[PDB]
Amino acid sequence: MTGRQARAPLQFLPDEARSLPPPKLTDPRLAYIGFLGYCSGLIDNAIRRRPVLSAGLHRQFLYITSFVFVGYYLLKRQDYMYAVRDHDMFSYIKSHPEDFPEKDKKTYREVFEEFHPVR
Amino acid sequence: ARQWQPDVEWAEQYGGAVMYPTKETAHWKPPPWNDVDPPKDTLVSNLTLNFGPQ
Amino acid sequence: MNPIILIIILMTVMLGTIIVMISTHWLLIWIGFEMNMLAIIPIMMKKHNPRATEASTKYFLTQSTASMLLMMAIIINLMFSGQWTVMKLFNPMASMLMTMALAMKLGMAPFHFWVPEVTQGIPLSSGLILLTWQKLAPMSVLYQILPSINLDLILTLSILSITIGGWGGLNQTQLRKIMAYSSIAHMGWMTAVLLYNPTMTLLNLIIYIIMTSTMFTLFMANSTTTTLSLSHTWNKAPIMTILVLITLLSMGGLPPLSGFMPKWMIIQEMTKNDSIILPTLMAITALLNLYFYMRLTYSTALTMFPSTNNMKMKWQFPTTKRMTLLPTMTVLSTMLLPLTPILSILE
Amino acid sequence: MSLVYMNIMMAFTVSLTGLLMYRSHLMSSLLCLEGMMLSLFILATLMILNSHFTLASMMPIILLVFAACEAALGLSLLVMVSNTYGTDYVQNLNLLQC
Amino acid sequence: MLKYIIPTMMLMPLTWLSKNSMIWINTTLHSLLISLTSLLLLNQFGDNSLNFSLTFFSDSLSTPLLILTMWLLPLMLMASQHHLSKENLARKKLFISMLILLQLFLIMTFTATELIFFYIMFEATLVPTLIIITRWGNQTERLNAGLYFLFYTLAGSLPLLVALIYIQNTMGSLNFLILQYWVQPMPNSWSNTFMWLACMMAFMVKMPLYGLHLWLPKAHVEAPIAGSMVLAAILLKLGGYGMMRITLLLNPITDFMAYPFIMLSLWGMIMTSSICLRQTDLKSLIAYSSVSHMALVIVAILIQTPWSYMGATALMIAHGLTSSMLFCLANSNYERVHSRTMILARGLQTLLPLMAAWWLLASLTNLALPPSINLIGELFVVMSTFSWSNITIILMGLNMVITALYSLYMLITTQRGKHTHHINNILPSFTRENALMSLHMLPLLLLSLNPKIILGPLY
Amino acid sequence: PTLRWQEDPEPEDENLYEKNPDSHGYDKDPAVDVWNMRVVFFFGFSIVLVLGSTFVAYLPDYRMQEWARREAERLVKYREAHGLPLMESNCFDPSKIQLPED
Amino acid sequence: KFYIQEPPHGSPNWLKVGLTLGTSAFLWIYLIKQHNEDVLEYKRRN
Amino acid sequence: LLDLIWLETILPKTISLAQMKMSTTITSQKGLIKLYFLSFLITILISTTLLNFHE
Amino acid sequence: LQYGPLAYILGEKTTKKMTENSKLITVDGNICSGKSKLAKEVAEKLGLKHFPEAGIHYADSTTGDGKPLPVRFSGNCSLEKFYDDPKSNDGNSYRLQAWLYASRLLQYADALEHLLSTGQGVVLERSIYSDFVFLEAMYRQGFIRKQCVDHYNQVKKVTVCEYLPPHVVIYVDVPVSEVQSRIQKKGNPHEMKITSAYLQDIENVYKGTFLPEMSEKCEVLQYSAWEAEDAEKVVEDIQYLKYDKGPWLDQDDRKLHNLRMLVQDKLEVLNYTSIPVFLPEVTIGAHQSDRVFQEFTELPGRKYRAGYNEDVGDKWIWL
Amino acid sequence: AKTLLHQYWDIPEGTECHRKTYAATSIGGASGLVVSAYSVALKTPTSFLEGVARTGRYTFTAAAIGAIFGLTSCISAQVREKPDDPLNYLIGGCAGGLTLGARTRSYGIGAAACAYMGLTAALVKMGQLEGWKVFAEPKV
């Protein structure tokens, strides 16, 4: 997609984003990001030859805080982008009627099918 | 420890300059570990001049 | 090489790339590419040896002739319809010259003969920073000038770049030439999708830069140039082994790891067009550029080469180098399979 | 079409082929880079004077100050190459073998 | 089935922070808890599947295979000591957690809604087995074995993805139910033949078909025992599972382009049952035995009969059990004599007087003795193929004769008649090995009593 | 005049017998071997095997079987009682059809 | 105990751990405040 | 014959030797940069006159 | 610790710590003569730090506690076996030589690092140039196959050619019989078991190659056997020594910064210790390396970054 | 050029022979001149006479591949008269592969050339006859 809010160039979220709900508490994707943050802390304890799962707990909580925060803002922008994609799609649906005809859904009483019986 | 381990001839295969030899690969050499090729001597420009008599 | 002056030169590399990103005027883009060249020369020759001298020579000649060919393209563009906007061009000849100048700059298969030469003799910091920025910045310009490109040009360069970067990579027993051939293959992938949906290409740019950052960080961790040294870093440093395992399989492109989200999303928004024979050819060649990764992984961790001692001396001294940002970039590069709907973060 | 544009584009293409094929001197390669600079200079300047588009006469002065500092960088590189060898030939550059 | 997924994620870090001499009991006990938990699922009633929000469902195409995998995990694990016992505690934890991850992606693979997710979990099945067999393969070409494994499975499985994206953007989403309900035949064009050839060829490589079965035997002779059993049973029956899933679409052209594959599998079945008669390297006989049985499976899948599909899933489950057992006895013999060669290890009638009974019972289940479920599978496939062509029963019966011949020759060669009186190091057989025997065969007979479960969705 | 190696002649036949002949299959800790006996001979045979055998001995009517038995009995009793032929062909309505005519 | 000529670190400073915990708790408070503002904005607009 | 050695000569050998030959012809180049600029020249000329790109 | 380029820029300099006490004085000489006596005499009478006998277990002495670990972790040199029978097929000369080279390079980097750290100069004995001479002499005895000498020569070409030489070299000369008398009087039989032509080749090479190829770099003080054991005369001769020759007079500042921030984190130096070339006397195979590294990492002191090593300290691992 | 590969597609298939074969020789000779230009620019044949000889060998061999392919295509199309099946060009690709093996005077490379060229040529005719577009839609 090309903007379609190619007016404000790096408006990270307009007031258009303040009408859809934000990502809620204990959504599974932010919990996945938090587990990835704990894994980042585990491997940061692993590389520096300090004991893994020990003596770096402030760094553990730092990494978890940072990744949960960044993933929260990414989820917000993500949901705004899919919402504006959906709304522009439906605006183009409602705009032009005649290019999108209602296909006359014939029931199976008259819809013929080639069969080719398999043995 | 009874398990097979890779050895000196596998090590000789996975080394050298390039892996697969040709009829032309003999000019390639393994790189120096310093990445430095120092020795050459440039004294041909000891250029003479006859500050002469007159 | 005073460190204040090094901070100055790195800020000028940043400045050249930002000037490329920021303008609508074509001469500012040419200024940005040139300032990028001028400051990326002395990130090389951080050592003394004349290998860096010859590498900087070859890189300077090819980079400057690509920049001059781009200036030719802009000047013929304004021989025709005269505007300084970065938009759809108004000359097929100028689009031809412009795509070939960018093909010489960021590496394509008729034009890549300087890339293992420049990456062989230089240190790893210079190689990392030139691979990241010199494969970043003209993707912005390509993203801008995409609506006026003959598709034969980009597509032929991309196919041939992937297959040459694959076929060259099998033989090298170095490391930098393996990484450079992989760079050519990924630039072929990142160019091949440009005329269809460029969000795919720019997200491939993000993922490839994260991958190359993890790679050259793990090679800054231990001064290794051959696979022999990789085996000795198996025997001296054990977590490095499994990280080389995971990141090398992620450069391979295997699905439960996060090297798959670049390729497969490209194939999705590629085969929603009527091109099927070309994605299956390209992805079989992406099967081809994985064998040198496999022999590299074999030489590191899956097999255990005999190791020279004095590691008995080295065991008292742990890995006391510096790491740029190793764990964050690592677990961002590896465990990012299920966030494929972070496709749409880009636009 | 302003027929002088044909000969200046001809001079560009000849200077480009001279930049590409070259015998032994990297000095001559930098010299053909300087000539290609001059060719793009004269073509862009005659463009701007045909158009009377004199707000943007920035192309000549800025194009040639930048490409001339490029040529200065190349000259210092040739100084370094001829320092760490005897001459500046294309031969005795075949080390760092691919 | 997320109540099966999340205990597997809650089983892995326990092994990481398990103390010394306590990794084993924890992993074994909790995997047996997972086995009872797996046994809870078996509920599939009547007309439909049993669905679960979008990702999960269960059929009898998937339920006995899933129960097979989760029953196989402790058996796998308890085969996998005493040949890495002197290795490190950290490397032991790494190996066990790798197997747990492989089980997790296998459950992901069998409980899949979309074929895209099936492809992701297919090569997720691929990746850990590589590292396992190449690291611990314990011979000089475990390198070559892992490399052939990975390149054949990728290079076959890869254009399947492009065909699946094509089916995605030509028919909407890729639920198995929508593809039951929105499918329409695609006639004999050429591109239909290419798409069918890509999908079926990816699965052919996974089976293995006879054209590309050099894949298998190096990866069986050059693997540790856990990866051996996983590779054989779960990977080949996973390939057949995937073919049974995809073949619901594209019916009308398989009659036109299935004639080379059926022929290749039949003649390769005869040639493979002949080649596993006369080889050395006792391990590899069961490898080509598995090749022969999966060739029979392929013929059964593509001749498209309900009798054929019931016999196909019966033959899958029975051969998975029998081949996993017989690999474990082969590992017991290699623990004894340190050979892998057939003609060296001899005797074992005086010595080891009840290990021989498990060799006998395994070879009789392989022989298709008539209460073995192998015979139920082979019998239904024979009925269907004689309905298919009325003359190909001769290849079936010749396969039957040669199958009984090589299996019983493998019995009586090494294990009937005379010790070589220079071996002199065998101890009497451990309770662990006999425990793995009675964990293999007691569910086989107690499934052989009331086997109405394991037959397919065309019950 | 060359060796190419340095490593020791290893390993040996570390018999798991000749130390603890009462012991079961795996490694040298003589308590947790008894614990393994307990866990694999109570959780593989006692609580899993015979419980699964009695679970598969009777579970509900898998694939609707006894339901189908009794429903077929009642329907054949119906079609005996009304005199119409049992299992008439054309399961769909022969009137509710539209053949594509020439 | 057991060391010679220094332990280089291991005895941490008392500005870096306080800095990291302070900015971490600050970012948690800021994201909680952000979520409360967003729920208020959503329920005020709809 | 037919199983082992003939399948090893059909599938892996032909592919592997083709990739070996193409690798040992592509990467087997020397450092005369005149040759690389001549490759650039013939690439520009094949782009101009052989296949039309401005047309 | 905290040292780097950022602390260099935000800090003052690295230059103003000069001179006349910060110096590399290096007393070298023949075996059994030039050792801790004269070096600790000048360390007394100059007020300047000293380094002891740079031997096998210096790499043990440089960290943790200074316990000499046995030769399964700090060997496999077997110095007493080398003095008993230096002829074995199993390899006993070159592993010892490479171990001595790496340990002397470590102590040389320690000396240069403490020299750059504000002073106040160090006195050294038997540096790495002398180790080069030592291996060349025992090659002249015919104890090492020449290919392995070429391996060591490649190591020496790679490593030392980007460092600095010492300031001054004080040579001790003692002839054959007086060395034999002193080595009798010390009483070690393994020291007595060494042969005389070995000392003769040490004398020949170490007089005819080292002192020539110094060549007014590393200015010298060549003392004989009769004129020695006087700290007064040699310390007076060091204060005579005007500092005008060698690379040490022109650095200017930036290469000193490179040496300060390169000699720290000593594995950076140790990157080029093992090349490898694969060495049929040196490369230990896989199984022995595995069990040696495991039975090293179960020592309680060297157990994963000793600053964080539990049951040693540091009583702060945050609950 | 695109215009004369379009001329090669311009003949009905069908037969208008000597012309389909001449178009095949032209395409093969153009490809041989391309590959000979690469192989003379990347080798320094030293000297110009050997460069002319190598270019002559590569152009004559690629043009002979084109000639023999056009010959057996023309004859198979005249005989069997079926423009549907690409089996005619399967035969054509194998004939070109065997003659490539003859011009390289090896047999294993020739048999592999028969296999690969026959399958790719049958694929080219097969995808042209069903209709698979060249390089792009380029639309969506």
CATH code of residue D49: 1.10.287.3510
CA-CA distance, I38 to I127, in Å (whole number)?
16
C200 → chain A, closest CA residue: A1
How crowded is the C-beta side of D4, counted as CA atoms within 13 Å?
Answer: 8
Q: What is the CA radius of gyration of chain E?
A: 22
* Under 8 Å between Cβ of C183 and C107: yes
Question: Which chains would you list as touching B if contact means 3+ CB atom pairs under 8 Å?
Answer: C, D, E, F, H, I
F1 → chain I, closest CA residue: I89
Let me know if residue F3 belongs to a domain.
no
* Under 8 Å between Cβ of C169 and C252: no
Question: Which chains would you list as touching C if contact means 3+ CB atom pairs under 8 Å?
Answer: A, B, D, E, H, I, J
Instruction: Tell me how far CA of residue D34 lies from CA of D46, D65, D69, I106, in angstroms.
Output: 19, 11, 11, 53
Q: Shortest CA distance to D53 belongs to which of C82, C87, C76, C94?
A: C82
Q: Is E155 helix (H, G, I), strand (E, B) or coil?
A: helix
The two three-digit tokens of residue B49, written as one number? 């001049």
Interface contact A106, partner F, CB < 8 A: no
Q: Considering only CB atoms, which chain A residues are within 8 Å of E6?
A: none
Q: Is E58 helix (H, G, I), strand (E, B) or coil?
A: strand
Cβ distance B22 to H28 less than 8 Å, yes or no, reads yes
With a CB cutoff of 8 Å and minimum separation 6, the contacts of I214 are I169, I220
Instruction: Tell me how far CA of residue H54 lies from CA of C90, C104, G39, J4, in angstroms.
Output: 11, 19, 57, 17
- How many interchain CB pairs under 8 A, B with C? 50
Q: Compute CA J117 distance to the chain's CA centroid, rounded to the nearest angstrom.
A: 9
* Under 8 Å between Cβ of E73 and E64: no
Count of residues in chain D = 98
Looking only at the bridges linking them, the beta strands covering I24-29 and I122-124 are parallel
> J49 exposed, middle or buried (CB, 10 Å; 0-12, 13-18, 19+)?
exposed
Cβ distance B4 to E86 less than 8 Å, yes or no, reads no
Let me know if residue F2 belongs to a domain.
no
Cβ distance D80 to C53 less than 8 Å, yes or no, reads yes
Q: Shortest CA distance to D36 belongs to which of C105, C65, H41?
A: C65
- How many interchain CB pairs under 8 A, C with D? 77
Distance from CA of I101 to the nearest CA of F (A): 21
Instruction: Tell me how far CA of residue J66 lies from CA of C107, H50, J86, J104, in angstroms.
Output: 33, 18, 17, 16
With a CB cutoff of 8 Å and minimum separation 6, the contacts of C206 are C346
Q: What angle do CA D16, D19, D24 make, to 5 degrees?
A: 160
CA-CA distance, E151 to F4, in Å (whole number)?
34
Cβ distance E214 to H2 less than 8 Å, yes or no, reads no
How crowded is the C-beta side of E356, counted as CA atoms within 13 Å?
Answer: 16
Q: How many CB atoms are closer than 10 A to CB B54? A: 2
Cβ distance B2 to F11 less than 8 Å, yes or no, reads yes
Q: Shortest CA distance to C141 belongs to which of C85, C186, C90, C196?
A: C85
Cβ distance H11 to E275 less than 8 Å, yes or no, reads no
Let me know if residue A69 belongs to a domain.
yes
Chain position carrying tokens 């090293």: I296
Nearest to E252 among A53, A116, A119 (CB): A116
Let me know if residue A78 belongs to a domain.
yes
* Under 8 Å between Cβ of I24 and I170: no
Do at least 3 CB pairs under 8 Å connect A with F?
Answer: yes
Cβ distance D77 to C55 less than 8 Å, yes or no, reads no
Let me know if residue D7 belongs to a domain.
yes
* Under 8 Å between Cβ of F60 and E45: yes
* Count of domains observed in chain A: 1
- Strand partners for I283: C308
Q: Which long-range contacts (CB under 8 A, 24 or more apart) does E428-433 make?
A: E428/E352, E429/E332, E429/E352, E429/E354, E429/E355, E430/F16, E430/F24, E430/F25, E430/F26, E431/F24, E431/F25, E431/F37, E432/E78, E432/E82, E432/F24, E432/F25, E432/F26, E433/E328, E433/E332, E433/E355, E433/F25
The two three-digit tokens of residue F73, written as one number? 């009995």
Q: Considering only CB atoms, which chain I residues are within 8 Å of B3?
A: 287
With a CB cutoff of 8 Å and minimum separation 6, the contacts of I315 are none
Q: Please report which residue ranges of E111-222 form alpha helices under DSSP H.
A: 115-136, 142-157, 159-171, 176-181, 191-206, 215-221
Instruction: Tell me how far CA of residue I317 lies from CA of A48, C103, G10, I300, in angstroms.
Output: 15, 54, 9, 17
Q: Considering only CB atoms, which chain J residues are within 8 Å of E189?
A: 130
Resolution (angstroms) equals: 4.2
> E13 exposed, middle or buried (CB, 10 Å; 0-12, 13-18, 19+)?
exposed
- How many interchain CB pairs under 8 A, B with F? 6
Q: How many CB atoms are closer than 10 A to CB C306? A: 28
Do at least 3 CB pairs under 8 Å connect G with A?
Answer: yes
CA-CA distance, E224 to J22, in Å (whole number)?
62
Q: Considering only CB atoms, which chain J residues are within 8 Å of E191?
A: 130, 132
Nearest to E161 among C264, C298, C303 (CB): C264
CA-CA distance, E196 to E125, in Å (whole number)?
23
Nearest to F27 among E39, E44, E85 (CB): E85
Put residue E42 in one of left, alpha, beta given phi > 0 → left and psi -120 to 50 → alpha.
beta
CA-CA distance, E86 to E225, in Å (whole number)?
17
Question: Which chains would you list as touching G if contact means 3+ CB atom pairs under 8 Å?
Answer: A, I
Q: Considering only CB atoms, which chain I residues are within 8 Å of B1?
A: 287, 290-291
Nearest to C254 among E123, E134, E151 (CB): E123
CA-CA distance, E59 to E450, in Å (whole number)?
19
CA-CA-CA-CA dihedral for I18, I21, I24, I30, to nearest 10: 170
Q: How many CB atoms are closer than 10 A to CB B9? A: 9
> J6 exposed, middle or buried (CB, 10 Å; 0-12, 13-18, 19+)?
exposed
Q: Is I220 helix (H, G, I), strand (E, B) or coil?
A: strand
Question: Which chains would you list as touching J if contact means 3+ CB atom pairs under 8 Å?
Answer: C, E, H
Q: Considering only CB atoms, which chain J residues are within 8 Å of H39?
A: 38, 41-42
Q: Name the DSSP letter for residue E241.
A: H
* Under 8 Å between Cβ of H39 and C113: yes
Chain position carrying tokens 């130096």: I269
Do at least 3 CB pairs under 8 Å connect G with D?
Answer: no
- For residue J14, cis peptide bond before it (omega within 30 degrees of 0): yes
Q: Considering only CB atoms, which chain D residues are within 8 Å of C57?
A: 26, 77, 81, 93
The two three-digit tokens of residue E48, written as one number? 């439909």
Q: Give the amino acid at B40.
A: K
Q: What angle do CA C92, C94, C95 make, to 5 degrees?
A: 60
Q: Directed axis angle between helix E115-136 and helix E236-246, to 10°?
A: 170
Let me know if residue D17 belongs to a domain.
yes
Interface contact C155, partner J, CB < 8 A: yes
Q: Which long-range contacts (CB under 8 A, 24 or more apart) does F47-50 make?
A: F47/E32, F47/E36, F48/E32, F48/E35, F48/E36, F48/E39, F49/E442, F49/E443, F49/E446
CA-CA distance, D25 to D88, in Å (whole number)?
7
Q: Give the amino acid at I125.
A: E
The two three-digit tokens of residue E317, written as one number? 């489950």
Let me know if residue D94 belongs to a domain.
no
First and final C-alpha spacing in chain C:
40
Q: How many CB atoms are closer than 10 A to CB C28? A: 16
First and final C-alpha spacing in chain D:
47
Q: Considering only CB atoms, which chain A residues are within 8 Å of I310?
A: 51, 54
* Count of domains observed in chain I: 1
Q: How many CB atoms are closer than 10 A to CB E68? A: 22
The two three-digit tokens of residue D45, written as one number? 């300047």
CA-CA distance, D20 to D18, in Å (whole number)?
5
Nearest to D86 among B28, B37, B44 (CB): B44
Structural domain including F53 reads 17-102
Q: Name the DSSP letter for residue E351.
A: S
Count of H-run helices and E-run strands, chain H: 3, 0
Distance from CA of I216 to the nearest CA of C (A): 25
The two three-digit tokens of residue E65, written as one number? 């295979």
Query: Among C44, C79, C93, C118, which would you mutate to test the D interface (most chain D Cβ atoms within 10 Å of its Cβ)?
Result: C79
Q: What angle do CA E74, E76, E82 make, to 5 degrees?
A: 105
Query: Among E148, E152, E214, which would you mutate to test the H interface (most chain H Cβ atoms within 10 Å of its Cβ)?
Result: E214
* Under 8 Å between Cβ of D40 and D12: yes
Q: How many CB atoms are closer than 10 A to CB I295? A: 11
Cβ distance I312 to G2 less than 8 Å, yes or no, reads yes
* Under 8 Å between Cβ of I305 and C318: yes
Q: How was this structure determined?
A: cryo-EM
The two three-digit tokens of residue E140, written as one number? 């000089």
Interface contact I308, partner A, CB < 8 A: yes
Q: What angle do CA E437, E441, E445 make, to 5 degrees?
A: 160
* Under 8 Å between Cβ of I76 and I216: no
Query: Among G32, G41, G43, which would you mutate to test the A interface (most chain A Cβ atoms within 10 Å of its Cβ)?
Result: G41
Q: How many CB atoms are closer than 10 A to CB C13? A: 22
B34 → chain C, closest CA residue: C49
* Count of domains observed in chain C: 1
Q: Shortest CA distance to C30 belongs to which of C74, C65, C62?
A: C74
* Under 8 Å between Cβ of C186 and C205: no
Looking only at the bridges linking them, the beta strands covering C307-308 and I283-284 are antiparallel
3-class SS shares of chain I: helix, strand, coil, % to 5: 50, 5, 45
Structural domain including C125 reads 1-347
With a CB cutoff of 8 Å and minimum separation 6, the contacts of C273 are C196, J136, J137, J138, J139, J140
Q: Is H23 helix (H, G, I), strand (E, B) or coil?
A: helix
> J39 exposed, middle or buried (CB, 10 Å; 0-12, 13-18, 19+)?
middle
The two three-digit tokens of residue E161, written as one number? 């993805």
Distance from CA of J81 to the nearest CA of H (A): 33
* Under 8 Å between Cβ of C313 and A42: no
Q: If contacts are CB pairs under 8 Å, which of residues 12-51 in chain H contact chain D?
A: 27, 29-34, 37-38, 40-41
Let me know if residue D1 belongs to a domain.
yes
Q: Shortest CA distance to I270 belongs to which of I99, I49, I145?
A: I99
Q: Give the amino acid at I262.
A: L
Nearest to C31 among D40, D53, D66 (CB): D66
CA-CA distance, B37 to C120, in Å (whole number)?
14
The two three-digit tokens of residue E262, written as one number? 């059926």
Nearest to I313 among G1, G8, G12 (CB): G1
Structural domain including I156 reads 1-319
CA-CA distance, I91 to I284, in Å (whole number)?
11
Q: Considering only CB atoms, which chain B residues are within 8 Å of H27?
A: 18
Cβ distance G8 to I301 less than 8 Å, yes or no, reads no
Q: If contacts are CB pairs under 8 Å, which of residues 59-98 in chain F contact chain A?
A: 96-98
Q: Directed axis angle between helix E236-246 and helix E306-337, to 10°?
A: 170
With a CB cutoff of 8 Å and minimum separation 6, the contacts of B46 are none
Distance from CA of H2 to the nearest CA of J (A): 17
* Under 8 Å between Cβ of I141 and I96: no
* Count of domains observed in chain D: 1
* Under 8 Å between Cβ of C208 and C306: no
Q: Please report which residue ranges of I25-173 form alpha helices under DSSP H.
A: 36-46, 58-61, 79-84, 94-116, 128-140, 146-159
Do at least 3 CB pairs under 8 Å connect C with A?
Answer: yes
Q: Give the per-residue SS3 of chain J.
A: CHHHHHHHCCCCCCCCCCHHHHHHHHHHHHHHHHHHHHHHHCCCCCCHHHHHHHHHHHHHHHHHHHHHHHHHHHHHHHHHCCCCCCHHHHHHHHHHHHHHHHHHCCCHHHHHHHHHHHHHHHHHHHHHHHCCCCCCCCCC
